[PDB]
Amino acid sequence: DPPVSRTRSLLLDAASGQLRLEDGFHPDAVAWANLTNAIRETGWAYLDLSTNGRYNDSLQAYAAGVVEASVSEELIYMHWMNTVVNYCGPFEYEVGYCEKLKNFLEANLEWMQREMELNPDSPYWHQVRLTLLQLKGLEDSYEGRLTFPTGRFTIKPLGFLLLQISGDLEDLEPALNKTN
Amino acid sequence: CSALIKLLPGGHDLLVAHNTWNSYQNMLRIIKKYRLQFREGPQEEYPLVAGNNLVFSSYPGTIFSGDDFYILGSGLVTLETTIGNKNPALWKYVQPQGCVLEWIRNVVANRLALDGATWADVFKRFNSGTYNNQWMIVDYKAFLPNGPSPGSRVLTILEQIPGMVVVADKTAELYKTTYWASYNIPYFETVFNASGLQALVAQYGDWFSYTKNPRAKIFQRDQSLVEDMDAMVRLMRYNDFLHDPLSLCEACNPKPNAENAISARSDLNPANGSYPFQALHQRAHGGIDVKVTSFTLAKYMSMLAASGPTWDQCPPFQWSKSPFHSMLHMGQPDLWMFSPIRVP
Ligand SMILES: *[C@@H]1O[C@H](CO)[C@@H](O[C@@H]2O[C@H](CO)[C@@H](O)[C@H](O)[C@H]2NC(C)=O)[C@H](O)[C@H]1NC(C)=O
Ligand SMILES: *[C@@H]1O[C@H](CO)[C@@H](O)[C@H](O)[C@H]1NC(C)=O
Ligand SMILES: *[C@@H]1O[C@H](CO)[C@@H](O)[C@H](O)[C@H]1NC(C)=O
Ligand code: NA
């Protein structure tokens, strides 16, 4: 049940030095996000989100995911419920497919983590890492627990990754011999 | 999804529009503006990426478009329609190692690219063979209002299937024909052939044809009527399947099919209808938006966006007044009668 407007910032505490969400606009923060929900009136919500370039881009990516999650929690929950809640759930028939998909996604995620470690100087893998940090921060935030990874991190194959891979799954499904 | 890239008469403007086809249950929508400060590489000496600013049509918890439609501060507009793959012999190219999933490849290309060539170059690396799309990359930096064809750089077409990515600059073709339409069918004959579409043309006919499918045909017939932003909205919203001969499905009973339009309304197909293949059935699926931009609008990181199934010439979709009232659609309006809005 989203409010018209919600603004959250993620500050890195000078002392802690821990990340904490605050309400409102704080341009000193690592990131801030503003969700305006006009779905009832226009069929759209609007998000704008900024990260602070005075922090490195890893922390920015993570924080970007965190702040998006914090201003859109209800929308995330509902979208998840509408779209992917049951996908490979606890009670799936297609356990053959779902196990293959979990294996695939875990191996894929591990392969990228490995490539990032093996290629700390790579622009490409750097951009991949930022993308996954953003994903990680989004999931962490929604879960209510902020852990900024400085090295390798684990993405849940069937967590918020599921919201990103809907188009990928259209082909993963047949490639992993799901019936149809 | 449908897309149209329209060169206005006299090259007055270049309009770029995309209409997502999706399950209606996906209709919690967020238009997202990201203002990031990422660098190209893991060191502070690295330049800021070309694509730090981006507006895109999206969904809750979805850290990319999914549609896709993006306006990037690098002057690029990236959009796709999905081609998929019907050749099972290509699936061996879908591997957990050596394949970066499409959504990440998309985000990364969007971030690093300053032009269509580099977008294609970045995106095609570690081709996963998943979310197999035709991507259109419009570089508005290469667009001169009123100017003649610059020969290159305005339009880059990329088509991905497993094990194969084909890329061409299609500026000349855009300027010559005055449009680029996209409608879920690969344009590159090598991609069309490699992904098993010939067999489906052979079995089902024109629907799988690049040039003869209903949308190709409607675009061929009607694209020139897009003379401005609202005309673009209108063609992108287009569904008049009951009365449009181009919406006739000859193997179907009844013959008018709501799938056979620019903006599908599969919900309006009869449940007891007889249909040669699943796309044509009654479904809680169809066009669920239009997003449109222009040279000036892209420049200001801005778009016209309309949310919901088309209601220009079809009754407005309304969950409670639909075969799909029991489907989960939390947070979603019941009645979908929304007009385009400037965003923002
Ligand atoms: C970017 O910034 C963060 C924050 O300053 C760095 O993370 C700190 O790293 C030290 C040593 O790695 C840790 O002990 C601190 O606990 C980290 N702080 C936080 C907030 O977690 C980080 O190393 C920098 N670089 C990268 C690549 O992330
Ligand atoms: C799926 O089945 C095919 C045979 O149709 C087989 O060759 C292939 O190894 C299988 N792929 C996976 C990943 O299960
Ligand atoms: C594609 O397939 C068609 C039908 O078999 C054939 O006529 C054509 O030569 C092929 N084209 C290419 C470029 O592969
Ligand atoms: Na798509």
From Swiss-Prot, chain B:
Gene (name only): Plbd2
Disulfide bonds: 249-252
Protein name in the entry: Putative phospholipase B-like 2 40 kDa form
Glycosylation sites: 193, 272
Residues represented out of the complete protein: 249 to 592 of 594
Superkingdom of the organism of origin: Eukaryota
Source organism: Mus musculus (Mouse)
